[PDB]
Structure formats: C-alpha cells, structure tokens
Structure 1
Amino acid sequence: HMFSRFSNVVSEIEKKYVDKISISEIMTKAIEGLLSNLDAHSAYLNEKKFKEFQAQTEGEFGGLGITVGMRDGVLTVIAPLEGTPAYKAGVKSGDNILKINNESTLSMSIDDAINLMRGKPKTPIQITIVRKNEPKPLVFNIIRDIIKLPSVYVKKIKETPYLYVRVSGFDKNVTKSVLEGLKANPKAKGIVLDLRGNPGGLLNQAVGLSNLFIKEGVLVSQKGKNKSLEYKANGRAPYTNLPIAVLVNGGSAAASEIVAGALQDHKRAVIIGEKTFGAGSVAMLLPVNKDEAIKITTARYYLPSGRTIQAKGITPDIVIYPGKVPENENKFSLKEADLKHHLEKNEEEKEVTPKMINDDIQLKTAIDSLKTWSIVDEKMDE
C-alpha cells in the first residue's frame, strides 16, 4: 500500500471541485484514465464497449442491417443489405429515420440510435420513417433475427486466369473462408490479395492465413518480460507454388502487417501500394468484472529475419499512389453505340470488370505483376 499520493488528490477534488460527484464516479474516471495513459493501445472495456468486441470478433450482429449515412446531418439510409429483415420489410435507399419506438430523432450521431435499435433478436421493434415524396411518416413494425456480415469475399477477374480476394478485418471466419474460396476455383493461376485499410484482429488468424501458403520456418516471434514465444509452419500447407500479389496502404495495421511481413521475408509474394501504419505489439484481453474487461499491451513482435516495424511501416517492393489509369487519345471517337448489337439477367458481381479496373491504378499494377510471374514460370519449366 502506497496509494496516499492518490488518496490525497481524490480527497481534495471531492471537497473543492465545482460540482457534486461520488467516489464511484471518481474511481471510474481514474480507472479509464490510467489504462489510457500506459501506451497508445491499452484500454478499459466497460459493459457498453465489451459487447462490441465480442460481436466484431464473432461476426454475428443483432439489428436491422440498414446503412445509415448522416446525409445533411439526418438519419438517411444509403442501402439496406440484401436478405436482412429490414430488406424483407418495405424500407429502401433514401428513407430517413424520424423516430425509434416512437421516440424522436434530433440530428444526433448514429451511436445511441443503434444502441436503441440493436434490441435482442427475439423481440419485434417499431421504426418511424420519412420518405422524401410524402408529407407524412411511414411506420414499420419489424420482427428481428441475427444477421451475418462476411469479412472476406473472392471474385474472378472477367478476362483472365486470376482471382481477387478481399480480407477487410481478421475474425474467426477468415482462414476457413479463404480455403473454401480457393477450392471452389481449381482453374485459377494467381491471387490478388487486398489488405488495404484492414486494422487487424485476432492473432491466430494471421498465423492461420499465412500458413495456407508457406511450408517451413518461423512465421512470427514474441518478446516481453514474462514467458517469450515463437510460431512455426505446420508443414501441411496447400497452394505452395501459386503466385501472390498483395496490396497494402497507410491504413493497414497490426495483424495485417504480420501476414504482409511474413510473406515478404520468405520471398513468397510481391508487396504493392504505400507504406503501412507501423503497429509492432500484441495485446491481451482480460475479464475484470462480470461484464467488464481490460485490454493491456503484453508483448512486442518480430518478423522472420529478426526486424521489427514499431513506429515505421512495411515498405512496398513496388510503390504506387491512387488514381485512374491513363487513356488512349483516339478512344474510338467515344462512339455511343459501344459496338452493342441491340438484337432484343446475370449475377455479374460474380466477376471484376474492366471499367472498375480502369478506376483503380493500384489494382491494375497488382494484375500486371502476376502477368510477369506467369512468363517466368513458362521459361523456367524447360
């Protein structure tokens, strides 16, 4: 016990501060203030925060599935996602949330609105809407369900032998969802892997994903004052010869930098894009009360060659800033007929199309690296 220096301060504050506050409020401010002051990433997860961490790392969410966008400072829905109970109901793009269970909106931020709207999946809820043509509200009574958000998806590229794989965050679904996504396309000759903007997630999915492609050696190593640990490939990897080009960006951080760093140090892929965020540590999450937890930075991590990235990111092999591709000055005179025949349905989101490759020069650059690798394999098989 040496808490006297602190106990004097809480004693002086409750006596001389402007307003009335309790020891329960002062101790809560001191706990959330201490963890926020150890390093950039330690934190206190009270009961309103801890439920979000569980939801995001499971991939399961309870609510409406309507994308609210704060247009003009008001609760306009940009898009319902397909197959959610609210998409089965009559709400559409451009609908505005006026009231929740007949309680009024007031240009407030989305945070407490979704805190009210995320009732448990067993219970129906009422929402009041304004649709832009109407002088009167629309009222929806919606029976609920759990909804699933996929963190990873895979597409063919329409003209060529190559796949596009997007991983948007790390969670328990990722390793299984990539493995089945390659098994469904046995004709494929290479992967573009898109980690742009991915903030990280569970550490066992960074080791899991990178072990789909590397056969032998260390993947990552940890150090800290207490016993420290090392991860090695299990020897059982599929896909050990397939070409990979990986895209990284200034928003890529933490677990995203573990897999991009492991592939770079083992010469297993080409790294393309811009310099990353530079987060070099691992954090452990501990329950401390019945519905409250703490997150505390517990180790630093090292890439297979013994280097580390704390406060300086991964540097690409090929550097390229964002923009649209250059154009031919002839362009068929911009013929409005488009070579369309006009002689007279498809799920075309099955494939990536040339129009939306021309809109992203970083994606074009990743495909042109795969086309170079395919030539060197056809040379070297002699």
Structure 2
Amino acid sequence: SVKSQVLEPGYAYLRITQFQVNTGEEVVKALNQLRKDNKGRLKGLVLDLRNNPGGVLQSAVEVADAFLTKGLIVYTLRFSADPADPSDKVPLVVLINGGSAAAAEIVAGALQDQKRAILMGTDSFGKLYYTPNGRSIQAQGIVPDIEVGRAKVTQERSSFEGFKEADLQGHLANGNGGADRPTGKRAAPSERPQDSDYQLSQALSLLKGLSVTRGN
C-alpha cells in the first residue's frame, strides 16, 4: 500500500498504490519513521497518488486527515478533518497521472481545495462525492492547477567537463578554510527515482522552489 523513500535531503517520498483498510495507520507510521529519518522536519513531500484506482472511504478520509488539520474532508456523510495530524505543515504537492480515481481522487481534492497542498500531475480519471469546496468531482473531475504531461527524461554524459578551479595547480585556498572539492571520477552511483520520470523531477524542483523563496 505505502512505500517511503528519502528522495533528497529534506524531501521524502510517499506513494499510495491502493487505499486499503488500515492504510491511514500505516501512512501515519511511514510519516513518523521518515520524520525520524530526516530529523524532525522535511522541506516538502511528494504524495504520489497516481495510478490509484480506488479504495475504502474510511482509508481515504483517514489519509487526508493524516495531513489536514481543519475543515471537512469529504462529503456527499460529512467527514471531518481532525486537527490531529503528524504532517506539521510540510509543503505538500500531490501527483495525479490521470489513473487516479475514487479514494485517491477525493484525498487529492481535499488536499487541493483546502489549499493544504498542490496538484502537479495531469487531469484525473474523473471518478457521488464533494471536495471540501462546494465543487463536485464525479461530474467533471479535477484539473491540476499546473499540468506536467507524463514524460521520460534521459541525461547524456559529456566526454569532458569544465576543469574546476580546484584542478588548477596552485589554486588559492578558500577564505573559510573548507576543503576544496576536486573533480575526481564522475559516475552516477545509482538511478534515483527523481531522474526516471519527468514528473518526479518536476515535483522536486518545484518543492525546492517554494523552499528557497517564500522564506523570508
């Protein structure tokens, strides 16, 4: 159901393939363990609620509560947003490839309409339920405020790279005294997921964007 991963320092990763019963408690546990992983605070999360067909409404509402504090989560049945949530207001962006529907769809709709998160994928599947906002979801579906068509990106290896100042003989040591970084061997140790599909890289870049600026 769940899977956690520290994509980059200060930016963890979550994925809810299906919204099964007890999924809320398990995602709470994942949140806690990743909070331990990245020392009590994350700069942003990427909830990968894509390719998610559906699930049990209790699961979806509890999952939404896991990140939302105030408001009504989803109604047709008026599910409330319990103020208790270990998220602690980590900037959340939700990914919707388009296969998202039902439980995932309502969770995304709540985390969007409450302005608690952002939707960065593509238009959802479109599968009555009402977001916390009066707008319906079944009739027309949810359009992400920013759309990133599914794409695959490949990086080429240049034969040579610019010889950094650390390479030149007799380069002046930095004033701070920190060790200069040489240009040793440059090979990718692993293919982290962010490089695989365009959407994950876009989401991480946008999350870093909201972290550098907007903080003043």
Structure 2: runs of 5 or more not aligned: 162-183
Equivalent residue, structure 2, for 1:333: 159
Match of 1:267 among 106, 115, 133: 115
> Normalised by the size of structure 1, how large is the TM-score?
0.46
Match of 1:372 among 198, 209, 214: 209
Equivalent residue, structure 2, for 1:154: 4
Distance change in 2, residues 1:311/1:217 (3 Å): closer
Larger Rg: 1
Match of 2:63 among 201, 204, 209: 209
Q: Report how far residue 356 of structure 1 moved.
A: 3.7
Distance change in 2, residues 1:356/1:333 (3 Å): farther
Is the CA contact (8 Å cut-off) linking 2:46 and 2:93 kept in structure 1?
A: yes
Q: Report how far residue 334 of structure 1 moved.
A: 7.5
Question: What's the secondary structure of 1:378's corresponding residue?
Answer: coil
Query: Are 1:242 and 2:96 an aligned pair?
Result: no
Kindly report structure 1 stretches of 4+ aligned residues shifted beyond 3 Å: 353-356
Q: Pick 1 or 2: higher relative contact order, CA cutoff 8 A, min separation 6.
A: 2
Is the CA contact (8 Å cut-off) linking 2:32 and 2:86 kept in structure 1?
A: no
Q: Which residues of 2 match residues 270-309 of structure 1 at below 5 A?
A: 270-279=118-127, 300-309=128-137
Structure 1: runs of 5 or more not aligned: 1-150, 223-228, 280-299, 342-347
1:101-142 deviations in Å (ceiling 9; x for gaps) = xxxxxxxxxxxxxxxxxxxxxxxxxxxxxxxxxxxxxxxxxx
1:303-360 deviations in Å (ceiling 9; x for gaps) = 11211122422111211112223646xx33189xx9279xxxxxx9xxxx55542221
Of 211-220 and 229-238, more deviation after overlay is shown by 229-238
> Normalised by the size of structure 2, how large is the TM-score?
0.78
The one-letter code matched in structure 2 to 1:362 is Q
Equivalent residue, structure 2, for 1:80: none
Q: Which residues of 2 match residues 1-382 of structure 1 at below 5 A?
A: 151-157=1-7, 159-186=8-35, 187=39, 188-222=42-76, 229-279=77-127, 300-325=128-153, 327=155, 331-333=157-159, 339=185, 354=191, 356-379=193-216
1:10-64 deviations in Å (ceiling 9; x for gaps) = xxxxxxxxxxxxxxxxxxxxxxxxxxxxxxxxxxxxxxxxxxxxxxxxxxxxxxx
Q: Report how far residue 153 of structure 1 moved.
A: 0.8
Q: Report how far residue 302 of structure 1 moved.
A: 1.1
Q: Which is richer in strand?
A: 1
Q: CA RMSD in A?
A: 2.4
- Once the two structures are aligned, what percentage of the paired residues are identical? 42
